[PDB]
């Protein structure tokens, strides 16, 4: 169905033990047209001393988001949902309930 | 302006050194009507031995997302943008460039 629609850091990326970089993702047909996506800097995590540790891993936190997209095409739009890397966390193989 | 719109885990939350819980957030007037939001389980981080450590902190990763919202009200909609807690990371007071 079709619906009418009106229209409207503490720098953790560096201080995190699973640090990350942002990579630009542009589509002139998508709203938002620009999405900066996180990529983990390491395979392991930075320990308290600033060294890479392979007893743990940096893994990205992905999120499902809504985006508008021109169809096929700038007048009519489609609501779409995409997977986006937001940041990184540090995990180990152990499950702590 | 108004635009016409058509319509369409590896359990890190437990294996993370900055673990988190999901809290439900419901609005029957919002699309998505349900958003599960992350809350850090601790102030510090879990070290490799499974103990809470206050040399580091769990902090949430927030993200700006698009949502549809009934105006004022179920026929016409408004595109809105909200802040959402997606997961947690582990930081320290040190900036590692």
């Amino acid at each position: 169905r079709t619906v009418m629609v009106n229209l409207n850091s503490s720098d953790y990326y560096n201080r995190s033990t699973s640090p990350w970089n942002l990579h630009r993702n542009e589509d002139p047909e998508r709203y938002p047209s620009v999405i900066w996506e996180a990529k983990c800097r390491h395979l392991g995590c930075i320990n308290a001393d600033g060294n890479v540790d392979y007893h743990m891993n940096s893994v990205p936190i992905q999120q499902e988001i809504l985006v508008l997209r021109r169809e096929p095409p700038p007048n009519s739009f489609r609501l779409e949902k995409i997977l986006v890397s937001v940041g990184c966390t540090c995990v180990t193989p152990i499950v702590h309930h | 302006r108004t635009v016409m719109v058509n319509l369409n885990s590896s359990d890190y939350y437990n294996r993370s050194t900055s673990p988190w819980n999901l809290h439900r957030n419901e609005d029957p007037e919002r699309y998505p009507s349900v958003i599960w939001e992350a809350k850090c389980r601790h102030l510090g981080c879990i070290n490799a031995d499974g103990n809470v450590d206050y040399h580091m902190n769990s902090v949430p990763i927030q993200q700006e997302i698009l949502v549809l919202r009934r105006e004022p009200p179920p026929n016409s909609f408004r595109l809105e943008k909200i802040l959402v807690s997606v997961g947690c990371t582990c930081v320290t007071p040190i900036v590692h460039h």
Partner: antibody, heavy 116, light 105 residues
Framework: EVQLVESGGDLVQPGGSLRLSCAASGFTFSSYWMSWVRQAPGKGLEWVANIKQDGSEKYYVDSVKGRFTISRDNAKNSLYLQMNSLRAEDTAVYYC?????????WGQGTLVTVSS | AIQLTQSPSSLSASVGDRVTITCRPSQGINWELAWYQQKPGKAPKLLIYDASSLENGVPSRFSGSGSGTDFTLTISSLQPEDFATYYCQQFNSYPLTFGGGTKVE
């Protein structure tokens, strides 16, 4: 880091040809669209052309159709602009930039002077 | 081809001034407008995309507003480094076009 280095700019007579290169580094060149934007001495910016990742789609500013040809060699991480039948109006600093709509990464530019 | 008209062509201000540039397309676009800052001799720098969104690393003194045929760029408290030329650009339809520019002195 993302780097874009243009070369090829020279002093050419009207009716001549020139091929510009843009050497990329710091990203997976084959994953992104590339663009050419020019700027005549003392004048504003003018978008020239763009090219899809696989080079299957090219777009041109009307004034350059027939004459100019955008191309890429993903193996060599390079963007190209073959400029034939050069007119005086083509005098500009040519910049290569990554992506289509909003251009964040630009090169330092290469100067093309069309004069007799 | 969508023509983009900027106003004023040039302007003079001091440090701390609230500066406002205006872009007006020939035909109404949605949010498909970007804003750039060009220091002399250097490549442009992207400030805003989607008419109102700040790019990664851009100071918060820069802000953007607008819809359809009226768009603005604002510098809340002008800094000594903001003395440059500002260009608007549309990404609504091919060929992509830029405004004539606005010099800030």
């Amino acid at each position: 880091e993302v780097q874009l280095v243009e070369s090829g700019g020279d002093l050419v007579q009207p009716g001549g040809s020139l091929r510009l290169s843009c050497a990329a580094s710091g990203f997976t060149f084959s994953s992104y669209w590339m663009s050419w934007v020019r700027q005549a001495p003392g004048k504003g910016l003018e978008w020239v052309a763009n090219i899809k990742q696989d080079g299957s789609e090219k777009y041109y500013v009307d004034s350059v159709k027939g004459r100019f040809t955008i191309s890429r060699d993903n193996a060599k991480n390079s963007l190209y602009l073959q400029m034939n039948s050069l007119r005086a109006e083509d005098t500009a600093v040519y910049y290569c930039a990554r992506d289509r709509g909003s251009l964040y990464y630009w090169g330092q530019g290469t100067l093309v002077t069309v004069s007799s | 081809a969508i023509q983009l008209t900027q106003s004023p062509s040039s302007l003079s201000a001091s440090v701390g001034d609230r500066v406002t540039i205006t872009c007006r397309p020939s035909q109404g676009i949605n949010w498909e407008l970007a804003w750039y800052q060009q220091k002399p001799g250097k490549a442009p720098k992207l400030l805003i995309y989607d008419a109102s969104s700040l790019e990664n690393g851009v100071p918060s003194r820069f802000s953007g507003s607008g819809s359809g045929t009226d768009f603005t760029l604002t510098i809340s408290s002008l800094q000594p480094e903001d003395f440059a030329t500002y260009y608007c650009q549309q990404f609504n339809s091919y060929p992509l076009t830029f405004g004539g520019g606005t010099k800030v002195e």
